[PDB]
Amino acid sequence: AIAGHGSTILCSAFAPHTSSRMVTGAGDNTARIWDCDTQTPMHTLKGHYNWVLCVSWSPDGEVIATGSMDNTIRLWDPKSGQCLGDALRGHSKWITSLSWEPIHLVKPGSKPRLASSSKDGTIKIWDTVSRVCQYTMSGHTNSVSCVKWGGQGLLYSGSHDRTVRVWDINSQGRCINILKSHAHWVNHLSLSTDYALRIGAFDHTGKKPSTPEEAQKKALENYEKICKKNGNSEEMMVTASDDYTMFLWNPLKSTKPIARMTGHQKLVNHVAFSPDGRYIVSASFDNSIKLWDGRDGKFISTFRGHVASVYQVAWSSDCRLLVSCSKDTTLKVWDVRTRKLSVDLPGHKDEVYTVDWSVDGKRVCSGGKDKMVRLWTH
């Protein structure tokens, strides 16, 4: 439990290379990097005129992107704490999501691009080095909820228009498919591989590549490690919406859902594949968390114990445990093998808005309406 934020915390993320570094965003228009070894602040990121809504590390660990209510995006250096230039303008409403291009589809010695979605129904591709809007993906007729840069050169966006759109980065922003199965606001979106996409060339030990060539190697190595289970690369996608349901996809392979996984009694606000894509877990406003099979999408078990709406879930690296935050101020980490609660955590005094597992599975962070960051260590 460490202070240092003047407003309610809205987001957080651990470093893809170490469990000692964590960035976070609040409504005090600032962001902060932390030392998880000493539980103390490190840097303060300033230059935003409004709430910092979402933060996203770079899969190489060199750059920190940040999205805000002020319709702009800022890139930062995690060690120095300096803004790497002027803001990234061209959005007319607030930023909803950030998605980085994975290292394996990125040339060695070169830096990965950045994708951002907004309430303006568009998604802009930025050049992090040259600082410019390379592409502007538009076509959604309502707010875009979430965007994910797939490890196969495709970007998937979900929106309030009950539609999930697929974008091709190898065709310079061309839209190749438009998925229409949902019947309400698509709230979130998770890929079977976005753990590998997030950590790029790093691993569970934190071993860094010695040369940009090695980074190009391990990036494709870690990605093929997971997306291949039959002999060829296959990445899956789950969507969550306000129609109480979810859909499993193999979008490139087929424009039609693999399964319609149903059973939640209220809207599904968050969904997350396992780090190995084996399980699927969904958090909903009916105070429940349901567990599904990552391969075919069959219902497995229900996680019970929350008294209020569940806001978000985060997977541990060992694919056995997972942590959740809810409106009822508490954090709970569940065990997939016992299909029930592992240990209950001393939670906050108010609503908890964000959680995260460290990549090595050592520490767990959280923050919310009481303006206080909390760190838990397994």
Binding site: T8, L10, C11, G27, W51, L53, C54, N187
Partner: peptide
Amino acid sequence: DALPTYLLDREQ
């Protein structure tokens, strides 16, 4: 108020 991304455009 300062609500998160998913709680914007949501009411009590």
